[PDB]
Paper text:
YdaT is a functional equivalent of the CII repressor in certain lambdoid phages and prophages. YdaT from the cryptic prophage CP-933P in the genome of Escherichia coli O157:H7 is functional as a DNA-binding protein and recognizes a 5′-TTGATTN6AATCAA-3′ inverted repeat. The DNA-binding domain is a helix–turn–helix (HTH)-containing POU domain and is followed by a long α-helix (α6) that forms an antiparallel four-helix bundle, creating a tetramer. CP-933P YdaT is a representative of a family of transcription regulators found in lambdoid phages and is functionally but not structurally related to λ CII.
The crystal contained a tetramer in the asymmetric unit. The final structure was built for residues Lys2–Leu124. The N-terminal His tag as well as the C-terminal residues Tyr125–His141 are disordered and do not provide interpretable electron density. A long (14-residue) loop between helices α2 and α3 making up the HTH motif is unique to YdaT and is absent from all other POU-domain structures. The long C-terminal α-helix α6 serves as an oligomerization motif, with four such helices assembling into an antiparallel bundle, burying a total surface of around 2600 Å2. A hydrophobic core is formed via the side chains of Ile103, Leu110, Val111, Val114, Phe117, Val118 and Ala121. The loop Ser94–Tyr99 here serves as a hinge region.
Numbering used by the authors:
A (entry chain A): 2 to 124
B (entry chain B): 2 to 128
C (entry chain D): 2 to 127
D (entry chain C): 1 to 123
Write the structure that this text describes.
Amino acid sequence: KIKHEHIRMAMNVWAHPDGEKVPAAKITKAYFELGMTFPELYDDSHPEALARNTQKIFRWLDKDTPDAVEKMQALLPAIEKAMPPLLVARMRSHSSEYYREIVERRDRLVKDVDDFVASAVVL
Amino acid sequence: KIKHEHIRMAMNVWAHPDGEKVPAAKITKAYFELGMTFPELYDDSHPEALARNTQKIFRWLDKDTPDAVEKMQALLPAIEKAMPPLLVARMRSHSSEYYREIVERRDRLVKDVDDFVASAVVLYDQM
Amino acid sequence: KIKHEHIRMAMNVWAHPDGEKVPAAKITKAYFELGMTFPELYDDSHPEALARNTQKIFRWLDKDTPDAVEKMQALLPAIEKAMPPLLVARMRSHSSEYYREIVERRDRLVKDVDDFVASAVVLYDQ
Amino acid sequence: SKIKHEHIRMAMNVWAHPDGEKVPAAKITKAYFELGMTFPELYDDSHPEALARNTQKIFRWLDKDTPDAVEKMQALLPAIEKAMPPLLVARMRSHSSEYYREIVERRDRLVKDVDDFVASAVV
Ligand SMILES: [Cl-]
Ligand SMILES: [Cl-]
């Protein structure tokens, strides 16, 4: 139900501030916490797990083959546990009316903020 | 700039939670901090100063004579220095489009926040 | 779930602006709307129900006897149905990490909001 | 030249980003004539491709670094400020004015305040 493209969108927004290694690291940590096995991610005994897990995760995210689409679907439990809750909600907003409402409320509030700050501005 | 009638409104909202003695006291504190003398408000050397100041301030607030209006106008420096800044903006909103837009935009943001708190409470009780 | 003393805190803040009769009144409508029997509150047929109900509700809130806690625990469905939602969240925050966090972040945003207004009203002195 | 050319460009590009350059050009042109301005040259209400020609001119200067380009944008500032969204004006000026830096900082904190709040509600 969560379309491959929306995982990709949310994942890129998550990677933009500090790069993919941050999302990759947190996804892996939650992946092992959930005792998962598919898709394959290198545990910490590999000295280059992170660079490898990063390259992997974003190759699948950027491909549109059925194998890659499936692998990201399997990873959803780990992404959701690890993603910032506000970003999970955007990811979910295209398939869940609740979360769509959540982001609309978030968006409404910051528009409230911007209009407010602007009214204070002089010049 | 601030019409007498607008001090009255903001002053009544200020007094409703805890009474008039609270605004009067805060007004007096700023009155003296600002080294004022007109109109006259009693320092602590006069008996029942707060009660007498309170009765004074709010008598001027409810009357509409040029004297009542004049004394309230002299008091503005103390009132605004003493009042919650948000309340000053509400007071000024009837005479300044700047502040009207700010209070109006502030109120919408806070209502929109609190409504969301409401939606979360409902999520529980549903569940 | 809600400890008796925390119902009391929330109840007094509700009573602070306009008195005890206001919350009592809102509680009375919700108790009947919610069809309750314990505790006992006087219907509209008593000409001094509201005052007596007001004294009733707030005796239990101010007492700590085993009886009073039991009566106040039953009234919570009415209190929560009638109380300002923000105040229920404050009330629930003493027992719910969810609400502790929600209320906290709410209070910070609004405090930052009001502070901004303070800085603009000050800069008016220009 | 307190406001560096590069910051007018940054601020101008975000303004143009949602709906294109014609919106900023149009709103800027309106303020230019309202202010009875004459330098740099912007075509009055009467020329043919005025908006498109005005759009290209305004954004040619923004993208050049020559002395004439810098000066024409500096001269245009009074119109840009009358027309630009106030929140962006503060952003544009924040590197040269402590007031606007403070505005922009207070704003960004409020938006994080919001995001923390919605996140806390999301669970
Ligand atoms: Cl709307
Ligand atoms: Cl021509």
